[PDB]
Design a protein around this nucleic acid. Structure first.
Ligand SMILES: [Mg+2]
Ligand SMILES: [Mg+2]
Ligand SMILES: [Zn+2]
Ligand SMILES: [Zn+2]
Ligand SMILES: [Zn+2]
Lengths: 292, 45, 49, 261, 49, 48
RNA sequence: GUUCGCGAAGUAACCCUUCGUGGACAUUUGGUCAAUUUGAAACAAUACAGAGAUGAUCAGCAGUUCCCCUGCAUAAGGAUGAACCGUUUUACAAAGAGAUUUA
């Protein structure tokens, strides 16, 4: 009689805005994604005319031990993933606390019947205990390779050119890109600075960033967009006995620009990975030369 | 909100209790604490 | 239901195995309602899944 | 928009052109419960797809758009859907607007609506996990995809870059010649899930690539999930992005306490 | 009978099958009862060894 | 569908409801393909 | 769409059509489920190994395990169905003797 007596665990976000919702109870529905035991399952639709039926995926015993919604698998108090909720509590306390998972099919079956609890749920279930840690969150917010030769590649790189502001080509050269900064954030700011939203469906611009050579290659379409890109680049460095470069300004990181006019084709940055690591060290000297 | 619980009517030809299958489950120790126990010849025996 | 090779037929295949318990009941209803030799054809009410 | 919002979605495959539900011929007699061939030995029964997705050509409005459907047609991702504008699922690539509507549901489901599992798989196959948000797609079978012709590893990298570029915001790509493996990371989970179904069991070779007549005999390029990245630069970078996204929700977890008071 | 056979196909055969005392296992079962009854009476006469 | 779910595809069921082996069976397949009276009584009844 | 009432038109012993209006009647289906490879039948074949006790060859029946198959089965079979025939140091002292050794 232990099957049908404990009540369900649905958060207010899954359940919706509707006044009174009809649900369907099935006493031996699916089995639990966590414990792999049969349990009573619940159907509901948020509105009466939804396209999608919401289904309880885990049982109530496995949800109580993690203090989570049976559908979201998110926290019942904070609505955050378990992969995050342990890491935030591991910052407030100097101890490290986690939710361990059983790999073996019978040991995960053994694990669900014990009525203790585990992970951060022993904090997040109590209202008084969980408030002290959210209080301490505020105080933290108050606290605020040489042997391989790369020469044939380095001649193709247009090391010595300017923003001459001529039409030239669609093609440009980027470098000083560091091990960070995914390619979408580059192509977003270039689209944000040029002004066009939804760059990808128009297919106006093309990017290649190698991320091991630390350099990047840019292509446009419809060349009148290309000079408008140069028309928006304000920051410059006039190198002392050299040719000027325009600078992209992502947060805290600087990307310097040369018009290509002959560059393309992958091999341009390096064939293997070690050949890119050697080119990383080649440009690291040249960027130090460029600033000082 | 509110919750109205409705049992769905099953196809009589379908395998009723689609979760039901013979399985072995080793069960943990029950939660209640332990009760106190309260309580020559070797050459003969 | 002559050729059940699609995955759309997986629940109906479990219904054919549930029907096997009730097959000797359907045989009795067929055989007690058989045409007698003075009639050419008989029409009968049926119940089908 | 130019492709999707103005058009209606077209029919990739007619229903009479749809492939037979019977698999080819593996053993001696066909089992009609499990729909497999029995009594013999199987002969490495994988095969390449005769169809594929054409993002700009095939996208368009569907009946799932008018009804408010969250999820995407998996047969549209495969290039197989026969309903066209009648289909109850979305025929276009997932974007930042629809992915914002896949927020509560995407924790346990994928973009097609399929439940995720606790354990991954022994070979990192079909659906994902609800324990780990994995945005990186492993690519394998590249020898089988190229139909055993040779190319340089720099040129293989570009041929992987182009066909994957359309399927969403590509974070980074790093083709390895030592192990013939592509590690393609996206911005979103929902675009990795879309791209995994879309380029599974395809061909890499282009129509001008001199083997476009013969490409059906292959096995296609395997697309499984990617394991954790062993080099220590990305692990520190993993530690970095763990910390900064933590502080973002350190802000909002004291705002809903501020709402509580 | 068909109900029992079909239930075994979808749910399996239980692992809690208790086999009865029939004429082929009677001498084995007498053994176990006499062996348990002798250990009971002797272990209650021993002090605490 | 019952014969196929067991894996017994070397057992052929004709349309007059005869169950026919197609093959010489191993010892393992012979133990596996013995059907009970409840199968065979149902088959003879369909046959009448 | 039907019907009741109302307001008009044309025909008109107020009747038949047609247009404009009020009320009535009838009221929320279905999904735990999307159509081949990546969320999971099996076997056969091949290769290796070989089916209890014992000096040796054999009838067997049990019990123990977070072991099953066949069978309607609480029957009976499945190598006597299978797996078990390996490893084992402290509730611990009493008596004495030597030697070392210190207020
Ligand atoms: Mg035995
Ligand atoms: Mg026996
Ligand atoms: Zn559970
Ligand atoms: Zn929820
Ligand atoms: Zn579709």
């Amino acid at each position: 009689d232990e099957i049908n007596e404990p009540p369900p665990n649905i958060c207010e976000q899954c359940l919706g805005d509707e006044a009174n919702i009809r649900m369907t109870k099935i006493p031996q529905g699916s089995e639990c994604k966590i414990c792999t035991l049969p349990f009573t399952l619940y159907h509901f639709k948020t509105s009466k005319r939804s396209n999608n039926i919401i289904k309880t995926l885990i049982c109530v015993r496995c949800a109580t031990q993690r203090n989570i919604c049976q559908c979201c698998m998110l926290d019942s108090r904070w609505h955050i993933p378990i992969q995050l909720r342990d890491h935030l509590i591991s910052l407030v306390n100097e101890e490290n606390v986690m939710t361990e998972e059983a790999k073996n099919d019978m040991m995960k079956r053994f694990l669900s019947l014990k009525n203790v609890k585990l992970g951060g749920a022993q904090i997040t279930s109590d209202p008084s205990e969980a408030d002290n840690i959210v209080d301490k969150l505020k105080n933290i917010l108050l606290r605020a390779y040489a042997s391989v030769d790369i020469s044939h590649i380095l001649k193709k790189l247009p090391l010595n050119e300017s923003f001459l502001k001529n039409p030239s080509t669609k093609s440009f050269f980027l470098y000083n890109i560091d091990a960070s900064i995914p390619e979408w954030k580059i192509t977003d700011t270039v689209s944000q600075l040029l002004g066009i939203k939804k760059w990808k469906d128009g297919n106006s611009l093309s990017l290649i960033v190698n991320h091991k050579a630390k350099c990047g290659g840019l292509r446009f379409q419809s060349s009148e967009l290309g000079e408008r890109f140069v028309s928006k680049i304000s920051e410059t460095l006039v190198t002392p006995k050299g040719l000027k470069r325009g600078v992209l300004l992502i947060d805290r990181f600087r990307i310097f620009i040369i018009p290509w006019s002959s560059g393309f084709s992958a091999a341009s940055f390096g064939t293997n990975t070690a050949e890119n690591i050697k080119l990383s060290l080649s440009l690291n000297k040249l960027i130090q030369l460029e600033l000082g | 909100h509110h919750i109205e619980v409705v049992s769905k009517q099953m196809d009589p030809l379908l395998p009723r209790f689609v979760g039901k299958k013979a399985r072995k489950v080793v069960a943990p120790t029950e939660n209640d604490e332990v009760v106190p126990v309260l309580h020559a010849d070797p050459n003969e025996w | 239901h002559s050729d059940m090779a699609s995955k759309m037929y997986n629940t109906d295949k479990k219904a054919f195995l549930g029907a096997l318990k009730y097959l000797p009941h359907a045989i009795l209803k067929l055989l007690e309602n058989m045409p007698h030799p003075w009639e050419q054809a008989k029409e009968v009410k049926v119940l089908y899944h | 928009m130019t492709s999707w919002r103005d058009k209606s979605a077209k029919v990739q495959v007619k229903e009479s052109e749809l492939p037979s539900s019977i698999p080819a011929q593996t053993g001696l007699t066909f089992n009609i419960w499990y729909n497999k061939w029995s009594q013999g030995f199987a002969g490495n029964t994988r095969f390449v797809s005769p169809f594929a997705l054409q993002p700009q050509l095939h996208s368009g409005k569907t009946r799932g758009d008018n009804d408010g459907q969250l999820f995407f047609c998996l047969f549209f991702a495969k290039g197989m859907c026969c309903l066209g504008p009648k289909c109850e699922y979305l025929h276009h690539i997932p974007d930042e607007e629809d992915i914002g509507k896949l927020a509560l549901r995407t924790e346990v489901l994928d973009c097609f609506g399929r439940e995720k599992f606790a354990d991954y798989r022994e070979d990192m196959g079909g659906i994902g996990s609800f324990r780990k948000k994995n945005k990186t797609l492993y690519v394998g079978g590249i020898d089988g995809a190229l139909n055993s012709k040779h190319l340089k590893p720099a040129q293989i990298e570009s041929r992987i870059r182009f066909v994957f570029s359309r399927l969403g915001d590509i974070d980074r790509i790093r083709y390895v010649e030592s192990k013939n493996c592509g590690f393609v990371k996206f911005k979103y989970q929902a675009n990795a899930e879309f791209a995994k179904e879309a380029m599974s069991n395809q061909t890499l070779l282009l129509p001008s690539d001199k083997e476009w007549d013969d490409r059906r005999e292959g096995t296609g390029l395997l697309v499984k999930w990617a394991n954790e990245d062993p080099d220590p630069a990305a692990q520190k970078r993993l530690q970095e992005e763990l910390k900064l996204e933590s502080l973002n929700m350190m802000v909002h977890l004291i705002n809903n306490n501020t709402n509580s008071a | 009978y068909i109900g029992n056979l079909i239930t075994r196909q979808f749910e399996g055969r239980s692992n809690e099958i208790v086999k009865t005392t029939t004429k082929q296992r009677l001498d084995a079962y007498y053994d176990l009862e006499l062996r348990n009854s002798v250990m009971d009476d002797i272990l209650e006469m021993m002090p605490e060894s | 569908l019952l014969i196929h779910r067991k894996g017994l595809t070397y057992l052929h069921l004709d349309y007059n409801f005869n169950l026919k082996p197609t093959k010489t069976l191993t010892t393992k397949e012979r133990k596996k393909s013995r059907l009970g009276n409840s199968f065979h009584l149902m088959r003879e009844l369909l046959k009448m």
